[PDB]
């Protein structure tokens, strides 16, 4: 049966995938600050297979940790294409959710969603180390769920 | 479609070519394959390339426009070129050394069956082969883009902008002016 | 008063200048610094085992909003629009008309989740106890409109959550 | 045979392994990916300009000292001569000047980079 | 004192039901740790502490394998933990809700609901105001 | 607080501390997270008489500034020359 | 790899923070001051807090000046565990960051205590602060400080005599003190050349 | 805890000795129980070409004793 | 027979390394008093499968700029240079018995040094190309200084076959009569193997990721598995020089028992010194061997050319 092969085979590339997620080195403003928490020992993201990675060629998720200015977008677009595929966006605080509390400035971008598509939006100003591990386990789980060989299968 | 929904906007485009198309983008990655068979030499083949902005173009202002309710549309570019000179002007814009070759219908219709086992997107087959070789038919009596205030952009002016990436690096940086355009049919 | 950091005269006696000698030639200091890592080998790691344990939080914790009831059912806001004017990134709307009774009540009261800043301003303005920031802090969404909160969405997370809630108001409403 | 076969098969497996990474993913190819990586602006020039050597006195001395390792590295069939008297003088009269070389170039101030 | 460390290894199979409930736990939840259970919740949940344990594991949550008609045997997170027992378990109390529990509304949810988020229950946004202008309406008959 | 002798001589060695002594993790001598309630005092302004506000006004006793020269004897400065700091008798030299 | 020219470009995080404050009462403009240095945040607010209150012709009460001491020096040890562990990670020492963020982790939790938040407390106002310290807590702190000094020897035992550490910081980036002064440095950046100022001892606050 | 780093270095210890054991044992195999003759220098290269012409089977590792005289 | 004896080699080697990117993880977070890989699988034993899988479906990419055919090959001679090196590994027999077989080593470990130029320069980046020229002056420091440390070395085995070392060290081992040789050698493979603290032709910190910023999925994955094979293979070089392990011909299976140990523990130490020291800057590396290693490396080799001639202990030449 190619619907069992390939449903199967999904669990793999899944599993494989949402098992060994390596984040940008990326980092904008304050809730860089509890990304970096989240790494520390009490949380210790590399437990969960989690490697954060300088190189966008080696890396799977984009954490927007931060505000982004309209002189910082283009910057951040161009390193987001840089990734292969597949890759995940998880934006992070209010800043990069919705503009937050600059929201209604002239130089900043409200929400970073309007320049890169978004998988997980982490709320909180910073969210706490354990909201972001939070956000990362939804976006594992989300990997999860995706179906791309069965959808292959019935095309 | 016309008598089940007999106000539908109908629009007949020719090829669209732009950045994600299977058509300027299908040429030059013929080149994977060392020269590029052509039916005839594609002497016996005309195309009217259109843009894909101005589809998109006009399909929005199709929406727009009541006039445009039970009508049906051909969208077509500026211009009508040889095949031969069509994939002549894409290896010459991508820089990519140009070798054509005739190639019969029944030995290039082969070509296409092998590519066709291909259990993911196959890169051509035989009904592609068949439509890249069938020259585009003249239709005055429907209207075109210009009937709904779209100016059809010309290949040579976004040509560049789709095959760019599929020059080396020695020729990455070539600009807009370098190549002459292909040769037209009044 | 200060002191010196960095001023220091080395011994030069034959003794001191053949312990620096040894200190080069057989690394004594960096292999020092291998000890303590090596130390820290031997201990227990701080890390928890999430999401089955968790980093210990307080009754003061400013997370998820939510709109409260008195005990008899009856909402707690009354459209004073003090959350409103006080709101440092202008992240509630609020609109308020005479209910089918007599009652003081809002029609609209919106808090925008990705304007927030989750200081707690709002809380403290209110007179009423009405509007609070919950201990919840696990509500990361798919979408960005799931954070762009309506009346029905806080009414619901305030009777979802209110038996904690109330709890950590009574721990703390002393200090306030 | 058996080392030319080592060989082959260390590099046939390793050409199979890129062969399978090149083919079995999904690609998706435009310009913005396949552009130059550089913090996330566009480069200023081109990575072909010429890149200064600030060793570039140690990097020939490099060669003087690296063929002087090929006449030492006869040495432990040396010992084995009956002429050790020769030998050992002639090996310690080779390092003696090599240690001179570079105790002349260290003086000189030929380690040191260039600014 | 190595034979006293295996012992306690050993007595963690035996704590945990067995070889298959201690394969259980240490596959669901990556630890194999024994504590003394303080109670349950109403969806399984089933909530340990361990007071010789450094402040942060000295309590902990082993999560129920199905709530609200979802299969969580693998799929867990922290939203499955109802407001009652999360006060204890985040360590804003020291009383669990079997010692103290809370006050009863008529108001307040029976039934606790994990994250809906990518789901069809998931929240949705909308005005929740009436319509402002009234459009004058035009007579229904012909009069002109 | 758990580990075995072996290894508490082990680590104390490397490291060249005591560690035992002084703990990373936290365990029992952090304070109970139920606390009994609080009862905060009150400021000097809770009083029911002599209490007047235009006696204890911060902000009405501000003034606009002083106008020393407007455009309409022995050399200064700003302030006396700072005295010189002195090393610390804790601990001059790190 | 020898540098010539050192241009660096900002404003990649303006977020217009002067302009926004012009539409908001004194009270809405604090939590600005968290997100300016987002290290240092109660400090940051301490000094928005002095300004608001000079203006003001008021004084905050004894408690709240020495509880903002405090979480001053609280939040001054937070700085420098970040300034020095990232220092060092950068220079290639890695693990004495992971050793130092758990002792940041336990202040966090004397900033979560006091305010409810990790970071933007919003916890020193002009006036004072916002609410008084819960009971039990100085026990904490003092737990806490009990045991920090062991913490920074281990991270000097890993740099401070390390002949690696020390060929990759001893006379690199030298400043006369000169040109410090006149190139508008301040703090650490003046006393590393000599200079002897701190305002602490200068120009004392609270 | 510290321990539970030993099953990577265990993993990791048997597959670092498979290629020494399976070497030897291979060795053994293919000459008859014996390890692997060693030619470093022409002459052993030509004792061992020598035992086999003399094995009569083509295989140096093949080795005749004193039934082989007469 | 043989190719039966090759894949017993070439897979142990990539599991081997495989399983040591989960070691390196968990030793590094217990030293930074976390744990590591714990959830993907048992003590986090199915990480290094996640990752080899996640990394092999992961889209590779070429820079548009790139030289396509050095960029291609390039991650091949990394892997395939990689399993070369352990054929001439005597444990206790080698795959190939060679008679230099210690000059073999030192022309494959030179020839792998043209995979981080080839493919730092045919990535045409500015950060590829910084972290390929410092892999040339990584080379300029450690070459001399390490093929005249093994010449010291073998002035007691007697010949370049490593299988005579295992005969030179049947009474002891070599690191008592040359352990300021084994100091030096081992700070040598260090940066032979571009180990911390001379990780600088990556030199994530300062380069971004150096040499290898634009490889990405199984190309990136090639210059990883090269790189942790050096590391073990050059531990197990370390142990065979200088931790001689006694060899019984009956019993072959027990040396290879105490010789894997002895290897494993050299293997662990290379994360040991990861986790304690900062970086050396590249010029601080090169004046590291040429003004300290170098003059006592040349004094050291005329003391061990004496030596055996003053001592009457010149060793066989077979
Ligand atoms: C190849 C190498 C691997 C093969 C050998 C495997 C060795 C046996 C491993 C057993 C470890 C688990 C012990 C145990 O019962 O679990 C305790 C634990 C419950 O005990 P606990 O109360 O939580 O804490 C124990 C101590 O109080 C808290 O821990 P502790 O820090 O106090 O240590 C206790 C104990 C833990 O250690 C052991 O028991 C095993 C020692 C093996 C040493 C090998 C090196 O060690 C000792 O008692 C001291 C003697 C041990 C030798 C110390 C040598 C140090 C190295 C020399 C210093 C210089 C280094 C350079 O139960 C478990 O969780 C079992 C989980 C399974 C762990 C994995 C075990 C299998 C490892 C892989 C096997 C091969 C595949
Ligand atoms: C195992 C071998 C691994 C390397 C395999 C190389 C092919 C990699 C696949 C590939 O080339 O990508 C697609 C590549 C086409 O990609 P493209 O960007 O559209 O075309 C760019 C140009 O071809 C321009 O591409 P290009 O810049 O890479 O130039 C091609 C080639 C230049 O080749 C030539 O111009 C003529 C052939 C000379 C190379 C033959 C040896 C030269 C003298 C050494 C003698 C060796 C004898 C043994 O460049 C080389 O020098 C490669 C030398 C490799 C020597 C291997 C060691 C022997 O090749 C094809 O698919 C056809
Ligand atoms: C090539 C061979 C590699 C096969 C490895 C298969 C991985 C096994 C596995 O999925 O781990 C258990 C995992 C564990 O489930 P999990 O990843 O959802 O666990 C979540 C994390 N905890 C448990 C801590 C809350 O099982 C699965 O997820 C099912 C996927 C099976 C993989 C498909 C096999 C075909
Ligand atoms: C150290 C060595 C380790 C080597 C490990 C080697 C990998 C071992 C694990 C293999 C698992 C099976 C691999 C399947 C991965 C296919 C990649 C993929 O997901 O593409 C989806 C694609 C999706 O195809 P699609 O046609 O539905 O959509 C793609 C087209 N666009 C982009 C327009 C949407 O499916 C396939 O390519 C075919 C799958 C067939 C499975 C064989
Ligand atoms: C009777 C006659 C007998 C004749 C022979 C007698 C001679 C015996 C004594 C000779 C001296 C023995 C030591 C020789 C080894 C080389 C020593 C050396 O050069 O170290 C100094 C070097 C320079 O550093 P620095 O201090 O900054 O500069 C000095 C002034 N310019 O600094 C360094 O090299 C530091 C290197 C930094 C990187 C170190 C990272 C790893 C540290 C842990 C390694 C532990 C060693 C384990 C070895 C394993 C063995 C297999
Ligand atoms: C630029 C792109 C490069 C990409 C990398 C490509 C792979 C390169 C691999 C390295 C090439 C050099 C190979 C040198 C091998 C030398 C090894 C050796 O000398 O020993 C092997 C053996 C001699 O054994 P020995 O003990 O010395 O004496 C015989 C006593 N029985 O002698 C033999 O076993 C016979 C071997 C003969 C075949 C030699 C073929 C060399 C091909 C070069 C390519
Ligand atoms: C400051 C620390 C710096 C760290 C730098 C890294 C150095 C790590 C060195 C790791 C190797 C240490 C030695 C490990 C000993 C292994 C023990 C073993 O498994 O075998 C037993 C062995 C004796 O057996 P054997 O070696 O065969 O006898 C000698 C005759 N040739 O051994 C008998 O006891
Ligand atoms: C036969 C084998 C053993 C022989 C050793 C062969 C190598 C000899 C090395 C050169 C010795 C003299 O050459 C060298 O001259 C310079 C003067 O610029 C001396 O001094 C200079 O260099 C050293 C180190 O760089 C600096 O700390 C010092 O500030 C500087 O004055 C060196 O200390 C000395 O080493
Ligand atoms: S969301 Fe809050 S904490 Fe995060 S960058 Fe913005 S202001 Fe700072
Ligand atoms: S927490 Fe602050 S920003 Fe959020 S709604 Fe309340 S007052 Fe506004
Ligand atoms: S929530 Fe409170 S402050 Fe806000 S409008 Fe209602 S009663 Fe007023």
């Known amino acids: 049966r190619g619907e069992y092969v390939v449903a199967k085979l999904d669990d793999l590339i899944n599993w494989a995938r949402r098992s060994s997620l390596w984040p940008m080195t990326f980092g904008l403003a304050c809730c860089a600050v509890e990304m970096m928490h989240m790494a520390a020992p009490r949380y210790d993201m590399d437990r969960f297979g989690v490697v954060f990675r300088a190189s966008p060629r080696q890396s799977d998720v984009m954490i927007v940790a931060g505000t982004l200015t309209n002189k910082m977008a283009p910057a951040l677009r161009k390193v987001y294409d840089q990734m292969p595929e597949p890759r995940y966006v998880v934006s992070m605080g209010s800043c990069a959710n919705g503009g937050g509390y600059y929201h209604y400035s002239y130089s900043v971008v409200r929400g970073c969603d309007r320049i890169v598509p978004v998988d997980i ?31 292959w299968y019935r095309r | 479609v016309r008598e089940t929904f007999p106000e539908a906007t109908i629009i007949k485009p020719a090829e669209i070519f732009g950045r994600e198309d299977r058509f300027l983008n299908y040429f030059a990655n013929i080149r994977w394959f060392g020269g590029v068979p052509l039916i005839s030499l594609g002497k016996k083949t005309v195309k009217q390339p259109v843009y894909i902005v101005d589809v998109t173009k006009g399909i929005i202002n199709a929406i727009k426009d009541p006039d445009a309710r039970g009508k049906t549309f051909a969208f077509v570019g500026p211009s009508r070129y040889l095949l031969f000179d069509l994939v002549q002007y894409v290896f010459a814009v991508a820089h990519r050394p140009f070798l054509p070759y005739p190639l019969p219908h029944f030995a290039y219709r082969w070509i296409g069956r092998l590519f066709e086992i291909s259990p993911f997107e196959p890169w051509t087959t035989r009904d592609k082969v068949e439509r890249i070789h069938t020259t585009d038919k003249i239709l005055p009596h429907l209207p075109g883009l210009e009937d709904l205030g779209v100016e059809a952009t010309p290949l040579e002016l976004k040509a560049i902008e789709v095959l760019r990436r599929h020059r080396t690096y020695r020729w990455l940086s070539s600009e807009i002016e370098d190549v002459q355009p292909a040769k037209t049919i009044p | 008063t200060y002191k010196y950091v960095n001023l220091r005269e080395p011994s030069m006696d034959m003794k001191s200048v053949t312990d620096r000698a040894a200190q080069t030639l057989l690394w004594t200091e960096l292999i020092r610094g291998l000890g303590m890592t090596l130390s820290y080998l031997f201990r227990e790691p701080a890390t928890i085992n999430y999401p089955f344990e968790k980093g210990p939080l307080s009754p003061r914790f400013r997370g998820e909003h939510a709109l409260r009831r008195y005990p008899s059912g009856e909402e707690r806001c009354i459209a004073c629009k003090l959350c409103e004017a006080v709101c440092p990134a202008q992240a509630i709307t609020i609109e308020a008309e005479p209910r089918a009774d ?75 | 045979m058996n080392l030319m076969l080592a060989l082959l098969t260390n590099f046939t497996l390793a050409t199979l392994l890129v062969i399978i990474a090149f083919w079995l993913p999904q690609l998706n190819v435009y310009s913005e990916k396949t552009s130059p990586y550089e913090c996330g602006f566009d480069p200023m020039g081109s990575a072909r300009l010429p890149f200064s050597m600030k060793f570039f006195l140690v990097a020939i001395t490099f060669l003087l000292f690296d063929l002087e390792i090929a006449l030492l590295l006869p040495l432990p069939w040396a010992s084995q001569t009956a002429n050790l008297n020769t030998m050992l003088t002639m090996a310690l009269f080779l390092i003696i000047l090599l240690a001179v070389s570079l105790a002349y170039e260290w003086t000189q101030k030929g380690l040191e980079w260039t600014e | 004192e190595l034979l006293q460390v295996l012992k306690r290894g050993l007595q963690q199979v035996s704590g945990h039901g067995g070889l298959r409930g201690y394969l259980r736990v240490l596959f669901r939840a990556n630890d194999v740790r024994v504590g003394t259970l303080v109670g349950e919740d109403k969806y399984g949940n089933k909530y340990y502490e361990d007071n010789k344990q450094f402040f942060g594991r000295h309590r902990w949550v082993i999560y129920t394998t199905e709530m609200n008609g979802k299969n969580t045997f693998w799929d867990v997170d922290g939203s499955m933990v109802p407001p009652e027992w999360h006060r204890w378990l985040h360590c804003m109390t020291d009383d669990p809700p079997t010692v103290k529990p809370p006050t009863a509304r008529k108001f307040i949810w029976t039934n606790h609901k994990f994250n809906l988020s990518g789901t069809p229950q998931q929240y949705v946004p909308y005005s929740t105001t009436r319509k402002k202008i009234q459009e004058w309406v035009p007579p229904s008959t012909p009069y002109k | 607080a758990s580990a075995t002798r072996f290894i508490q001589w082990l680590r104390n060695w490397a490291s060249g501390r005591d560690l035992q002594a002084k703990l990373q993790l936290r365990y029992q001598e952090i304070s109970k997270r139920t606390q009994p309630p609080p009862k905060l005092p009150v400021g000097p302004s809770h009083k029911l008489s002599n209490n007047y506000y235009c006696t204890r006004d911060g902000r009405r006793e501000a003034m606009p500034p002083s106008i020393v020269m407007s455009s309409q004897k022995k050399a200064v400065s700003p302030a006396p020359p700072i005295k010189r700091w002195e090393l610390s008798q804790d601990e001059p030299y790190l | 790899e020898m540098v010539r020219k050192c241009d660096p470009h900002i404003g990649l995080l303006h977020r217009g923070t002067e302009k926004l404050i012009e539409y908001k009462t004194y009270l809405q403009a604090l939590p600005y001051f968290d997100r300016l240095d987002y290290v240092s945040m109660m400090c940051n607010e301490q000094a928005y807090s002095l300004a608001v209150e000079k203006l003001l012709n008021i004084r905050p009460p004894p408690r709240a000046q020495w509880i903002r001491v405090l979480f001053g020096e609280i939040t001054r040890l937070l700085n420098h565990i970040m300034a020095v562990t990232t220092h060092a990670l950068d220079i290639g020492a890695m693990t004495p960051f992971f050793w130092m963020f758990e002792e940041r982790e336990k202040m966090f939790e004397f900033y979560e205590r006091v305010s409810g938040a990790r970071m933007h407390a919003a916890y020193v106002r002009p006036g004072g602060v916002h609410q008084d310290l819960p009971l039990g807590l100085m026990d904490d702190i003092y737990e806490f400080s009990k045991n920090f000094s062991l913490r920074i020897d281990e991270l000097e035992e890993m740099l401070t005599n390390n002949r690696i550490w020390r060929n990759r910081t001893v006379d690199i980036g030298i400043v006369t003190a000169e040109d410090a002064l006149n190139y508008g440095f301040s703090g650490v950046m003046l006393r590393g050349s000599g200079i002897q100022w701190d305002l602490r001892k200068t120009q004392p606050y609270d | 805890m510290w321990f539970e780093v030993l099953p990577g270095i265990a993993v990791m210890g048997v597959c670092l000795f498979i290629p020494g054991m399976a070497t030897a044992r291979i060795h053994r195999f293919s000459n008859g129980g014996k390890e692997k003759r060693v030619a470093h220098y022409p002459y052993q290269w030509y004792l061992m070409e020598r035992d086999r012409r003399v094995s009569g089977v083509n295989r140096s590792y093949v080795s005749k004793g004193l039934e082989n005289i007469d | 027979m043989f190719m039966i004896n090759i894949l017993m080699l070439i897979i142990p080697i990539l599991l081997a390394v495989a399983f040591l990117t989960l070691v390196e993880r968990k030793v590094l ?290």
Request: glycine share 6%; with cysteine.
């Open chain 9, 29 to 318: 977070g217990y030293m930074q008093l976390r744990k590591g890989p714990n959830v993907v699988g048992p003590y986090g034993l199915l990480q290094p499968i996640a990752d080899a899988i996640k990394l092999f479906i992961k889209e590779p990419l070429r820079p548009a700029t790139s030289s396509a055919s050095m960029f291609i090959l390039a991650p091949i001679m990394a892997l395939g240079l990689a399993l070369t090196m352990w054929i001439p590994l005597p444990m206790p027999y080698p795959l190939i018995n060679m008679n230099l077989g210690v000059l073999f080593m030192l022309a494959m470990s030179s020839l792998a040094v043209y995979s981080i130029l080839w493919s730092g320069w045919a990535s045409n980046s500015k950060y590829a190309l910084i972290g390929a020229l410092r892999a040339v002056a990584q080379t300029i420091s450690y070459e001399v200084t390490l093929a005249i440390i093994l010449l010291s070395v073998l002035l007691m085995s007697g010949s370049f076959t490593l299988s005579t070392l295992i005969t030179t060290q049947e009474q002891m081992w070599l690191i008592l009569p040359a352990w300021p040789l084994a100091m030096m050698w081992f700070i040598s493979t260090l940066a032979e193997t571009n180990r911390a603290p001379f990780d600088l032709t990556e030199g994530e910190s300062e380069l971004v990721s150096g040499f290898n910023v634009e490889y990405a999925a199984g190309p990136f994955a090639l210059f990883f598995m090269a790189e942790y094979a050096n590391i073990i293979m050059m531990n197990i070089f370390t142990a065979i020089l200088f931790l001689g392990t006694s060899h019984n011909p009956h019993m072959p299976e027990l040396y290879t028992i105490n010789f894997t140990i002895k290897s494993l523990l050299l293997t662990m130490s290379f994360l040991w010194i990861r986790a304690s020291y900062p970086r050396f800057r590249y010029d601080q590396l090169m004046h590291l061997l040429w003004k300290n290693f170098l003059p006592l490396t040349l004094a050291l080799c005329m003391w061990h050319v004496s030596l055996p001639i003053l001592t009457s202990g010149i060793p066989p030449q077979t």
């Open chain 3, 102 to 176: 007599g009652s003081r009540r809002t029609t609209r009261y919106d808090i925008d989740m990705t304007k927030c800043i989750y200081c707690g301003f709002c809380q403290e303005a209110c007179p009423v106890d009405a509007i609070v920031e919950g201990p919840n802090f696990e509500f990361s969404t798919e979408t960005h409109e799931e954070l762009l909160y309506n009346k029905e969405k806080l009414l619901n997370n305030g009777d979802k959550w209110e038996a904690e809630i109330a709890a950590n108001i009574q721990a703390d409403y002393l200090y306030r």
């Open chain 1, 121 to 151: 939006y982490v709320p909180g100003c910073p969210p706490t180390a354990e909201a972001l591990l939070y956000g990362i386990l939804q976006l594992q789980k989300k990997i999860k769920r995706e179906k791309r060989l069965r959808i």
